[PDB]
Subunit: 224 residues, 2 copies
């Protein structure tokens, strides 16, 4: 998916902001200078600036915001790509958020829309046995259970996690042990949902976070 020039402009300036070249409260260089420094025309620059405004990173007057105050989950992939010095455990942070938030919305789904939850978990049957397929399945199951809670804001959170979460999963689910543990987990969730054993969701999800995390910790070493 080739980035067009306005996207490259936004990425380049966003990186500089997140990196601290432009501290909160500072002003970007004027258009003529900025476009010449980037080697772009000013029409493309203003398109890139539009993207930065939408990201919450700047305000046209361009004043630079504190990205830790204005950014949502939409910056997760950027923090990972930069391997930002402020979030050395970003990957671990994201898996911990997925685990702990999913204990909420999985329990809720089992009580509110168990028929939808079982429909989502059933997709684990007939998944292809390889990394990309499992990464997609796994995200779709957590996202589906988040919406099955009846509270679509959990689903919006999963949508925001999609990029970085599935990037992790595409690496993780190359391991056949990772795929087998996930299948066991989805099946156990389905069993819990079928029985109505809502009070067991917490331990099951916490245990899966722990066991998958041990496999992931070994695998992530081999990665940038």
């Amino acid at each position: 998916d080739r980035q067009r020039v306005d996207e490259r402009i936004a990425t380049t300036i966003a990186d500089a902001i997140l990196d601290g070249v432009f501290p909160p409260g500072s002003t970007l260089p004027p258009e003529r200078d900025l476009a010449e420094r980037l080697g772009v025309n000013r029409t493309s620059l203003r398109q890139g600036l539009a993207r930065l405004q939408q990201m919450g990173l700047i305000e046209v007057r361009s004043k630079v915001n504190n990205f830790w105050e204005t950014s949502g989950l939409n910056i997760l992939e950027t923090l990972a790509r930069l391997d930002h010095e402020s979030v050395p455990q970003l990957i671990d942070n994201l898996l911990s958020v997925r685990t702990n938030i999913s204990t909420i919305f999985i329990r809720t789904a089992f009580r509110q829309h168990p028929d939808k939850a079982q429909e989502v978990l059933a997709t684990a049957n007939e998944v292809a046995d390889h990394a990309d397929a499992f990464a997609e399945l796994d995200y779709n199951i957590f996202r589906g259970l988040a919406f099955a809670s009846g509270n679509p804001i959990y689903g919006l959170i999963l949508n925001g996690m999609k990029g970085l979460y599935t990037r992790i999963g595409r690496h993780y689910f190359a391991n056949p042990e990772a795929r087998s543990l996930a299948l066991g987990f989805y099946h156990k969730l389905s069993a819990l949902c079928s029985e109505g054993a809502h009070d067991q969701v917490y331990e099951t999800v916490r245990r899966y976070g722990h066991e998958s995390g041990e496999i992931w910790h070994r695998m992530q070493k081999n990665l940038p």
Copy 2:
């Protein structure tokens, strides 16, 4: 702010189903004319919609299913467009805030109690008035999210700021609302001081229940 208004108008039309998922938008010239705007302003608006994932581009601007691609950034739009389901969206947000905060408040108290106390201490310097209180309440929940040591909880709170503070600016006009919150922050501070990590859950859930009752009787 024309390009912002363009993006919002088109985003509203997508969420309202005027432009169906999988459709492609009218060509730029046609869309500019319909919106009564310039093509370069429309192109800035389209860049914004691509940035937020609502449309995808050697091919037209394809409309994504917004329930698959949108984040917390559409909360304010959902509330603006769906007057009849704001009570449910609002309860949904408050429930999310309540239950997610049980996680990150406990972690902050366990891992970084001094930082958690410094956030909670901001409750001592508030004007007893709606708009200032709504900002303080948000800043306490956001601050505790970051004080967990996991900034992704903070990014979540950042995404809820818009709609969450809008509710708060209505809610905290009520003096009981302000009183309950102050008591909640002081109770949080006590629990942190005591290391009573296992009590945050019930205290936060009780707050969410009791503030929701005040809110519901206001509504």
